[PDB]
Each structure stands twice: as structure tokens, then as C-alpha cells.
Amino acid sequence: TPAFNKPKVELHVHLDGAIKPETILYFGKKRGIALPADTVEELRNIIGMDKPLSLPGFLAKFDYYMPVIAGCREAIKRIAYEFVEMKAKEGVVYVEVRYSPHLLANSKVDPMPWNQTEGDVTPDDVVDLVNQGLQEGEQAFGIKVRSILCCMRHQPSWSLEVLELCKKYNQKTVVAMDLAGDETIEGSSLFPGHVEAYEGAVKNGIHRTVHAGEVGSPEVVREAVDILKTERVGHGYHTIEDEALYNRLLKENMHFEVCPWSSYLTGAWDPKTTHAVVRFKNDKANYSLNTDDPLIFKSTLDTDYQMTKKDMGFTEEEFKRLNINAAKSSFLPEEEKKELLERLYREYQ
Ligand SMILES: OC[C@H]1O[C@@H](N2CNc3c(O)ncnc32)[C@H](O)[C@@H]1O
Ligand SMILES: [Zn+2]
């Protein structure tokens, strides 16, 4: 009984937010770095979330383990290879992982992250490491996996570099650019750095996706679509507040990377109101189901499917339909995208 026992497509999930508590414990002791706990169980209760907190409160959880990974090549390549394994077990045939290359490096990064000590793992180096562990997992488990480099809202100076990384690793797993981080930061979507990086992505052919509407107003989503020129909208739950902007995005067939369990734990979705995804399922909108950060939300792709099934009354037909759309909205090249749609239709028969 796993809600939807059929191939799936995940377009929204962060690598640094989907690491096995066991691997975190392994590198914590191997490098001698402190950890909130010394047990996979207790470490799960410290990093994991039980009740709804907030976007700034959920983002702090990363501080507990990111230092144990960042800086180590062996750890960056391993978490990428294990990520594929996880997705292969959940029944996901195609996936798009996203992460901030700068948050995992300890060299050539202005504001050094996690108070690290200068080393040699450059940002361009973490993109290559992740490409290797992701490619190895593809041959060992049998699933297609592409990546997405993120732009941190609070750090616009890194953006232009994220764009160059997308151009250099184009198709070599990297298929797009994203803007994640603290959406509560006022005007973080208009910071010249971000705006310039997305302007170059539009003229260079780099795909785009922007975290918006998760906790901000409809104006933020409007800026990601009009000024940043996104091809997708991470979350976008608050878009319905602006009837005009929502119906316009509904006509343009804008994709909405939805994350149900995540919106409840971050406060992005008030539990006393109907979830936006319900309105999406009713309006036949383009959207996909995702996990966002399984490690911190103590969840699995099935969690979200079981949440929409029991609550919100989602049917298998809707599951096959929202997955066919995710495959159509994926940043795969035409040929590969056709192959994906050919496989799903064959398995959905
Ligand atoms: O994975 C890249 C970065 O994006 C941020 N993430 C993760 N999850 C997440 C959420 O969906 N909303 C906004 N930003 C997010 C984390 O800060 C992480 O370090
Ligand atoms: Zn996200």
C-alpha cells in the first residue's frame, strides 16, 4: 500500500536536504566535526521536524550537518551517489536534484560557509563531484538524473558564477538554474546579482526555475515570472491569492513544483485552509508532486502521495496525469523528453 505504486518524476528536491542520517554520522566522526547527536535516531529528531516552524526556522536545520559534508570530496561524491539510490527505491524513473555548489565548497568562496578552513574544493569542483556520483548512480540503479544549480537569495554575488557553472556543465547533468533560500528577505528577487544572472540565462539558453510563492506574496511570484523569466515556479502556493495572476499563469500552462508535506512543515500552508494543490487538481493545472527536503521533513516521496490521497482526495488518475505533466515540463532535451514520455505511457497502461 504505497498510494501510487508506479514510476514517478520528481522535479523538486534538494541534494543537501536529502542525506542519509547515517552518512552524516559517518563523516562527523571521521572528520572530528561536532554533531547535535551521536545516534541516527536522536540525530533524526534534532535535524528533522515534527511541527510547523517557518521558512527561516527550517533553513537553520542545515547548520547542524552541512559542515560535516562541505569541504570533503569523498562526502560530496557519496551523498550524490546515495541520492540516486534513494530515488531508485521510491519508484522514481526521472529526477532533477538541486543544490548550491557554493555551500559545499571551502575554496574560492567569498563569505566562507560554515566557518571552514581554506581548502581546495572549489565550487566548480563540487559540481564535478556531484556529476560523478550522479552518473555512477545512474548506471548502478537504472534511473535518469539531472541536476539544477541554485542561487542563494541572500548571496547575489555568487549568482553570476552559478550561471557560468550552468554553461560549463550544460547537459552534463546540469540542466537549469534555481533561486532558493530565504524568501522572506525583502526584495531578494530583485537584487541586481540575481536579475543579471537570470538575464544571461535567458540569452544563453539556460533553463530556469525560481522558488516563489512558498511563503511570499503573489508579487514575488509575479517578479519571478515577468522579471526573472522563470519557466517553472517552485511551490507557488500563494499565487491563487491574486486571481488575475493565477488565471494568467493557468493559461500559459505554467508549471508549479508542489511540495505538500513541505508546505505544512514550513508554515507555507496554513492547515485551516484548503491547500493550493487542491485548486490545481480541480483547475487541471500543470504541477508536480515533490519531496523538497526529505531528510529534514522525515519523509519519503510516498509521504506526499499519501497526504494528497487521504487528505484532498487524490485519485490514481490524477497521479498519472500530474506525472505526465512533470515529464513534459522537465528540462530534458526534446529527444530525451520523448523517451521519458514513452516509458511512462507504457508503464501506465
Ligand atoms: O539546496 C540548496 C539550498 O536551498 C535551500 N532550500 C532547501 N529547501 C528549501 C525550501 O524548499 N525553500 C527554499 N529554499 C530551500 C537550502 O538553504 C539549501 O541550502
Ligand atoms: Zn525547495
Residue type for position 4:
F
- Please name which ligand lies nearest the alpha carbon of 266: 1
Q: Which atom of ligand 1 is nearest to the CA of 259?
A: 11
Cβ pair 310, 260 in contact under 8 A: no
Residue type for position 136:
E
Residues in the 5 Å CB sphere of ion ligand 2: 292
Tell me, using a 6 A CB cutoff, whether residue 99 lines ligand 1: yes
The Cα 266–Cα 261 span in angstroms is 9
The Cα 270–Cα 240 span in angstroms is 14
* Residues near 292 by beta carbon (within 8 Å), at least 6 away in sequence: 12, 13, 14, 17, 259, 261, 262
CATH number of the CATH domain containing 124: 3.20.20.140
The Cα 154–Cα 73 span in angstroms is 25
184 CA to centre of ligand 1 in angstroms: 13
Q: What torsion, rounded to 10 degrees, do the Cα atoms 71, 73, 79, 82 define? A: -170
SS (H, E, C) the chain: CCCCCCCEEEEEEEHHHCCCHHHHHHHHHHHCCCCCCCCHHHHHHHHCCCCCCCHHHHHHHHHHCHHHHCCCHHHHHHHHHHHHHHHHHHCEEEEEEEECHHHHCCCCCCCCHHHCCCCCCCHHHHHHHHHHHHHHHHHHHCCEEEEEEEEECCCHHHHHHHHHHHHHCECCCEEEEEEECCCCCCCCCCCHHHHHHHHHHHHHCCEEEEEECCCCCHHHHHHHHHCCCCCEEEECHHHHHCHHHHHHHHHCCCEEEECHHHHHHHCCCCCCCCCHHHHHHHCCCCEEECCECCCCCCCCHHHHHHHHHHCCCCCHHHHHHHHHHHHHHCCCCHHHHHHHHHHHHHHCC
Cβ pair 66, 122 in contact under 8 A: no
346 CA to centre of ligand 2 in angstroms: 30
Active site residue: 161, 183, 214, 223, which one?
Answer: 214
Q: Which atom of ligand 1 is nearest to the CA of 262?
A: 11
The Cα 58–Cα 183 span in angstroms is 12
**Domain range for residue 315?**
1-349
Q: Which atom of ligand 1 is nearest to the CA of 235?
A: 11
Half-sphere exposure of 259 (CA within 13 A, CB side): 29
List, in sequence order, every residue forming a beta bridge with 146; answer none if it has no partner.
Answer: 96
Q: How was this structure determined?
A: X-ray
The Cα 89–Cα 83 span in angstroms is 10
| Max Cα distance, the chain (Å) | 54
Tell me, using a 6 A CB cutoff, whether residue 103 lines ligand 1: yes
Q: Could you tell me the resolution of this structure in angstroms? A: 2.4
Q: Is the CA virtual torsion 262, 264, 267, 270 positive or negative?
A: positive
Is 214 marked active-site?
A: yes
Tell me, using a 6 A CB cutoff, whether residue 59 lines ligand 1: yes
Number of domains within the chain: 1
* C-alpha distances in Å from residue 73, one per residue of 68, 148, 165, 223: 11, 19, 18, 37
15 CA to centre of ligand 2 in angstroms: 10
The Cα 186–Cα 197 span in angstroms is 19
The Cα 137–Cα 278 span in angstroms is 34
Tell me the backbone φ, ψ of residue 14, rounded to 5 degrees.
-90, 130
- The C-alpha cell at 97 is 536534484
Cβ pair 197, 159 in contact under 8 A: yes
